[PDB]
Amino acid sequence: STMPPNYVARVGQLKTFTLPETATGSPSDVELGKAMINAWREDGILQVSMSPRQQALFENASAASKRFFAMPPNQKAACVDTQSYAGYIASGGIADYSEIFTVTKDLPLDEPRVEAKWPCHGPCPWPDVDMRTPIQQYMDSLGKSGETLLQMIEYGLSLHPDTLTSLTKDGWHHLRILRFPQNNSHTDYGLLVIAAQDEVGGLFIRPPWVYVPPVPGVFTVFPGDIMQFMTNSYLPSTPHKVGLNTRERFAFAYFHEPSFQAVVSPVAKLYDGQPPVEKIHYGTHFTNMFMRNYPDRITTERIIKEDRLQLLDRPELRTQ
After folding, report:
1. Residue 278 in 3-state DSSP?
2. Total domain count for the chain?
3. What is the CATH number of the domain that holds 256?
4. Contact 166, 154 (CB under 8 A)
5. Angstrom distance (rounded) from CA 105 to CA 311
6. What are the φ and ψ backbone dihedral angles of 89, each rounded to 5 degrees?
7. Residue 149 included in any domain
8. Phi, psi for 16 (deg, rounded to 5)
9. Count H helices, E strands: the chain?
10. Which residues are within 8 A (CB) of 170 and not within 5 positions of it... i.e. 6 or more apart?
11. Residue 203 forms part of a structural domain
12. Which of 86, 91, 213, 300 has its CA 20 to 30 A from that of 283?
């Protein structure tokens, strides 16, 4: 077993599926959607086989990840932006700290949303184009898989068409490039979390702890908090923790998210009788989570100094 030491968990026997290239509402899509829902309600997590074209993009993105983390520390620490939370975040012989490079929506300085000084909207601090192109193409392939999974959920739950896919139009998709060093419970604010890992392993989940073994050629998908809110605990939020192994581990964390301007509301079908009157504005939910997780960041201080949080109450940031 590739399980990190000093940890006690059960090995997971997850179901593996193959997503169709285009969800059309065929009887094959309805049967596949219902099978994925039962897997999420029983084990809390399922695996999806990568297409051979997606495997090439994962290898290119994994190569650009190791090339970035091989740079000197001061060259990586300079990858910070004052308008966007994307960039490098550190922990502390070779290395001994957990490093993360978040990639939010990359918008130039002349974009209307960045000119209006909206919170979290800004350029992405890429160190070079050699890292920007492969990681961007990897996010585009994960965006296609994330949308097909949402169409599977609407077909399995027999929801009205475009019930979930209409929220992710220009969605605030962001990717978290992780690196965990040698050994010598977190949540997830979103609809679906697509995670890909190497052969080292160290991912643990909590069914509705269980170790997720590394399987070549597949990525793992588990819902988050926003999915549980809309579905009335039908698809529960799966907590995840990472354990340090004997060797360095590289992994990805993709978040298929609604639009920054979209306001999610519970599904009236999945609620007995009347649904709650509560509504979550994702733009306010996203900024509140990053301002709490990264308080000492220059991005948070600028939002506080320039008082950009007052823009979250304007209707232009709530209609899309």
Report:
1. coil
2. 1
3. 2.60.120.330
4. no
5. 19
6. -130, 130
7. yes
8. -115, 130
9. 8, 14
10. 259, 320
11. yes
12. 91
